[PDB]
Copies of this chain bind each other. A is one copy, B any other.
Amino acid sequence: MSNRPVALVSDTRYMVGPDLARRFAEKGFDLVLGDPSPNLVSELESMGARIVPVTGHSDLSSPESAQAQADAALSAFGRLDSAVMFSGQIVTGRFVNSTIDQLRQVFVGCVEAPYNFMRAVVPVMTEREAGQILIITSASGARPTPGAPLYSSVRAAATMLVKNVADEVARTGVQVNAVGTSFMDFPAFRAKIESQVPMRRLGTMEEFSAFCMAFLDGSSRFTTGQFVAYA
């Protein structure tokens, strides 16, 4: 229905959200954005993108929230080519001081949210036989993370979920990938934050959005089921 490709940025209030939208607009995408600010909307429109804001669902807490975002792309543009989300709030503390309630808390943010996003977006894309999905996550799930054992465990489920979804839809030509970043390990999202990461360097939000475009901008279609640790 729409000649221009359509990208869904699930949340544009925080972290790399605004910069993803900027990169998408630079590459000729129209946009469905979770709770964008008025100045962000005007800025993207000055870059030539048509913007459809979706308000009130950027936390992706329910199956309905993700479906509302996917439905907004279909109603406005009739297509959904790219979709990206980030989620999850770190909880720290030794395993022997932890509680089952904390485990459920991180499971909700780290697993239920990517699950809901992909459950809504993947069927839209498989029917069109094209699509790129990026799940932005932590790298804590790749290996034991001292001080965040519960968080590391559920992040591992999220990455394996992405790999399972990708394997199931690989024949469709839909791509599903995950990128892990230290941006997701700090509740804010700089001196104190950098001191927690090994090399003491995060890079810029703009650089992060540029890297993410390798999995979202339509320039190549054969990477799927990958987890990449960024920076």
Q: Taking the nearest CB of chain B, how far is it from the CB of A74, in angstroms?
A: 16
Q: Which of B111, B144, B155, B228 interacts with A228 by CB under 8 Å?
A: B228
Q: Which of B96, B144, B157 interacts with A157 by CB under 8 Å?
A: B157
CA distance A146 to B124 in the complex (A): 20
Q: Taking the nearest CB of chain B, how far is it from the CB of A99, in angstroms?
A: 8
Say yes or no: is A39 at the interface (Cβ < 8 Å to chain B). Answer: no
Copies per assembly: 4
Q: Which of B150, B154, B164, B211 interacts with A223 by CB under 8 Å?
A: B211
Contact A203 B229 (CB under 8 A): no
Say yes or no: is A95 at the interface (Cβ < 8 Å to chain B). Answer: yes
Say yes or no: is A189 at the interface (Cβ < 8 Å to chain B). Answer: no
Interface size, A (range) = 35 or more
Q: Beyond the given A95-B122, A211-B214, could you list 17 further A-B residue pairs with CB under 8 A, ordered by the A residue number?
A: A100-B115, A103-B111, A103-B115, A143-B163, A146-B167, A156-B160, A170-B198, A199-B222, A201-B222, A210-B219, A210-B220, A211-B220, A211-B223, A220-B230, A223-B230, A223-B231, A228-B228
Chain A contact residues, CB within 8 Å of chain B: 63, 94-96, 98-100, 103-104, 107, 111-112, 115-116, 118-119, 122-123, 126, 141, 143-146, 149-150, 152-161, 163-171, 173, 175, 198-203, 207-208, 210-211, 213-214, 219-226, 228-231
